[PDB]
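Reader question, answered in our methods column.
A reader sent in the components of a multi-part assembly and asked whether the whole thing could be modeled at once rather than chain by chain. We filled in our standard form and ran it. Here is what they sent:
COMPLEX SIZE: two components
ENTRIES:
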Amino acid sequence: MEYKVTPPAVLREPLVTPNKLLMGPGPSNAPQRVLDAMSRPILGHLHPETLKIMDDIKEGVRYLFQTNNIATFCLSASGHGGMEATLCNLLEDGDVILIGHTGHWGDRSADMATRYGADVRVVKSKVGQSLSLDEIRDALLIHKPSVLFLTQGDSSTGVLQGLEGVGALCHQHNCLLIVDTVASLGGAPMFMDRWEIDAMYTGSQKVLGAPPGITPVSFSHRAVERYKRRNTKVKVYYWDMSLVGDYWGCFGRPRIYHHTISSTLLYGLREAIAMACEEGLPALIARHEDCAKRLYRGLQDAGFELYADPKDRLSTVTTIKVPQGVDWLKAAQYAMKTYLVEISGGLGPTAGQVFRIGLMGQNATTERVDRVLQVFQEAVAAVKP
Amino acid sequence: MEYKVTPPAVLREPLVTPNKLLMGPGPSNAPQRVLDAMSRPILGHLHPETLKIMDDIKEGVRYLFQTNNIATFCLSASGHGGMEATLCNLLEDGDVILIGHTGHWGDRSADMATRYGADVRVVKSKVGQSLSLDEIRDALLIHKPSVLFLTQGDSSTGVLQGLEGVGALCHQHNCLLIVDTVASLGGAPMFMDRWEIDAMYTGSQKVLGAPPGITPVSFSHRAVERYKRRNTKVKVYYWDMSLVGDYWGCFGRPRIYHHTISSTLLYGLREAIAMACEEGLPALIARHEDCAKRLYRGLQDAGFELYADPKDRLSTVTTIKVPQGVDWLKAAQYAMKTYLVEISGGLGPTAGQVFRIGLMGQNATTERVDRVLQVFQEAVAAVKP
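And here is the structure of the entire assembly that came back:
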């Protein structure tokens, strides 16, 4: 019996995972409590104890999102999967969607919407700015979409998009409002129901500090009604709102087999969410806002120039212009080799033009602000002509 | 300023995760080494230490699969994600796909294929049997598909589908062969390249005993060529072979950002794959076959009746007919309440018809076989007249 491929020598070496200060825009450092929880034994996907953990997670995301939506659950996918499922469920071929573009995430949602067969329209912000309510209204009137997509915290540009009045306006025009809060939840106000948002998701690895790979989502009654009026099945079984909602106990129905949830990731997320709910939103958001303000002061004292408009800044991700003369990638490598601290470059329209420093979860403390300020400064000084 | 939803009391309680013997068809009990590795700190999704782990995983999957395919990687999704991606990438609207149905997985693959816009044909095995080559050949001739989908180990019926000569036959007729090995890999022979299989995936949580949620996949040169002649983009960015392949270092292009992989699931999977590679395929699969043989002798001696034809049995999942007068659910509950041991009912077409005992990874040992034999018999005797 002949085996042309042999057992890899590489796998006889130990697994190596250096412990780093992750001060890029994500993932953030997991609290030790969430790491310890991910050593717990595996559970069956339909076991009562798993379902209880899932039930507890739902309450926690409703608190974090500030929603009472019955269709609140998590997707067994990284944060992109929230963008996929939201678009996949709420679009049919030819539907017109308006993308509010405030950075990379406008490009990515436009791409997915087009892959799903929608008629994609885009309104773009001014550079380093959010979209105004006027700009949103004007584009809505022009395009008459059935879905408007906005990113609350665009992590490529470090920009926080204001949301008040936008859901109400959409609903004057038979439009659903989808909002990405992956980078913004916990670091800026969010009230899903109050702001009349129809679909929303965040990530597990940003402010929460859970492992990447499971993503909380919620759909309003209006979004559920849209799903119910579809003429065809959603294109992906794996994302189908009704089926994963049933698995997560949301609607009238028996819990059945949809897929095997990762109980490991459930454990870390549940613990991450319990930590956040224990701090509470007012203190959690104020802590990130206050660390950002400390960072701005340190950066601006040192002669650095910030990318985003001062009125439009996202506390969790700070974009900073790469100074004339500096190789951003060399600066990044210097900080990592010398200190095991991560500083990042840009994303999409800001690739090569900015650094991005994340202040998220475990990392949004005055001590870690000071540490990243110190090492960012040295790394740039070390590579500058 | 007003929080209508209050921090949940439920999340103030300890997280509880009982340590059970998972002798259902998955997940299986994780080795302590995999649980330990999942407390390791998170890493950046594009850090060299993360890419190294991915590179090492690729080598281990090529070993396990027996393939040299360059397009080998893992999807950030549970096992259904392998089915989704394999179908998403290799099908365009109207493509004829033939599903070889040997149980539930035939229904699920037909469902996804139809959702993706394909023209779906089905050829169904005899009850509790695999498809014969002649049955496959006849169906190929009737339908002239461009893809054939088989499930090597159908865990709903406990049936192992024979694959020798089928990829060769498909290729004589201008057809790709996709194979699900989620339940069979490590428990039955598999030689991806030797058997001329064009796309294949397995699960992390079955024989491997990693956490659920990341799924090894591979695509042959012919599959890659099919992808390249598409005239439409694949519907889901999250599953796009060429983009996840680039993130995984497969095609000679720069690694870029596609999505944040889960560090935690990489660590558990890496370690589970290293362990399986250490044991080696000959010994791994013989161990699962020998344990199944012991289980069969124990079951039949006790007067139980096996569901799958004796020539078509899958070692890792044994379907046993529910005896007349036994409430299978009640029996399952008795075993869990008294011993914290999981035994399962059926799935799709075998629902209400069978118990399923999984012998996978850590649980394919003579000791655990003896344990499940003992608890199963006791559970059944407890609820029977």
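What stands out: Chain A touches chain B through 96 residues (CB under 8 Å). Residues 1-30+280-385 of chain A form a domain with the Aspartate Aminotransferase, domain 1 fold (CATH 3.90.1150.10).
Send us your own complexes using the same form.
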